Ligand SMILES: [Cl-]
């Protein structure tokens with residue numbers, strides 16, 4: 001009597017909690033992605049200089065002078081470029097926040113066209129500044145990216161974390177691994193090649 | 201047997217959990233309000249262009265040319281850009297170097313009443329966060345009823361509601377805060393009971 | 399109704415999940431709160447708050463930019479002997495966005511070393527622009543801060559809201575009250591002193 005009814009009520013409560021728990025999960029998840037996007041957006045005027053030798057008492061002024069050198073040696077075409085701030089975070093990466101986004105895009109463009117950006121002979125690496133999340137997503141493609149590279153698919157990663165490669169004289173784009181699992185399911189060649197990596 | 205114990209402990213857990221959740225609920229909404237604001241703050245210099253025909257292979261420079269076209273065609277008297285990018289043609293987002301610049305564009309667009317591009321009507325709006333715009337729209341119905349009964353309402357930033365109750369202006373961040381308010385004022389409650397979904 | 403022992407056993411299991419999922423989602427929530435704290439602070443780096451400035455009926459960027467100059471002319475002459483991206487209201491506060499962070503840093507040190515800042519004689523203030531999370535994070539390190547300070551523990555506040563004091567002849571850092579709890583759980587003297595504050 002009194003006991004049986006107590007049980008049923010509890011079961012309804014537990015389920016209700018499970019439901020409210022779902023709608024909560026969704027909202028949290030939406031905030032996570034919302035943070036990811038805004039982080040990226042805010043880091044748009046930002047460039048990452050990689051492989052730049054560390055220095056003693058490396059203040060803002062020295063950094064700026066360094067960026068100048070990099071520009072004079074690689075693409076002096078530019079220019080004094082407006083720098084809102086520059087700082088350090090294997091040498092520590094250097095983050096550069098340009099006053100105008102246009103300035104960054106132009107420098108990246110200059111780098112990717114040049115190919116080998118160097119500093120006094122030593123190769124360095126200029127790259128976009130991404131959020132932890134986005135940056136992590138890109139790393140997860142890693143394993144697959146290499147296999148594709150190996151088999152001459154000419155893979156490429158672009159914003160946010162899109163994978164792209166050649167399949168049938170056409171370039172294919174994939175936002176996530178799931179979308180890719182669907183693609184290969186109808187192409188035995190790729191399916192066999194990417195069975196383990198995709199965890200299918 | 202003596203299940204009374206186990207089933208009682210379960211109920212206790214159940215209660216605990218319902219309180220646990222309510223707390224997390226609070227913190228989540230807090231973060232949601234913080235995102236709304238941070239987005240609003242960031243996109244403050246941004247402006248939204250709707251109804252602009254897509255162009256085959258259109259670089260960012262052509263986008264800027266399209267911007268200047270609209271300025272000449274609608275605002276003769278009237279420009280620094282950090283960026284202008286795309287998102288039925290996609291919305292175009294124009295980010296000005298100064299927030300002031302955006303404000304003058306909207307005023308001119310509102311004083312002109314109608315904005316065109318090559319003879320075709322387009323639209324100029326802000327770039328407020330999705331969470332904000334929706335929020336503002338949700339106060340709509342209630343705002344209409346309050347205006348009707350001469351409460352002199354007002355919707356400000358972010359999406360605060362403010363009207364006159366007892367010769368004293370009151371502010372409401374969300375609908376819930378309003379529900380608790382009317383709980384001690386029968387007449388008002390009776391007025392907004394259908395709108396508050398109570 | 400003897401099979402009731404069946405249903406109850408499961409309900410106990412369901413509750414265990416709800417608890418796990420509950421704590422796990424909670425961890426994500428905090429990671430989000432912490433993330434917002436981080437990005438809000440970052441975005442505001444080039445900012446300074448002007449507090450106590452008499453507002454007018456109708457203002458604008460230019461009229462405000464002049465007022466900003468009067469403050470410099472009146473308080474820090476050798477400082478202007480100043481690149482401003484934009485300035486505007488949120489008497490409301492006035493958010494001053496500099497072109498270069500280094501600039502903001504400089505003037506802040508000028509306002510802090512002058513101690514007393516005035517506009518036409520009227521006392522005003524220039525302060526760092528910090529997130530609401532960080533502020534309240536510091537505010538949470540309030541009572542606990544006063545207890546250590548009063549008992550001569552040399553407590554300090556390291557940005558963002560890191561609490562640090564000297565015990566056992568060493569210097570410890572603490573991000574959240576939780577970590578501090580883990581610490582005093584083994585220091586009877588300290589524990590007894592910080593039990594009321596940590597709600598322990
Ligand atoms: Cl929950």
Ligand SMILES: [Cl-]
Nearest residue numbers: 028031231430
């Ligand atoms: Cl959250």
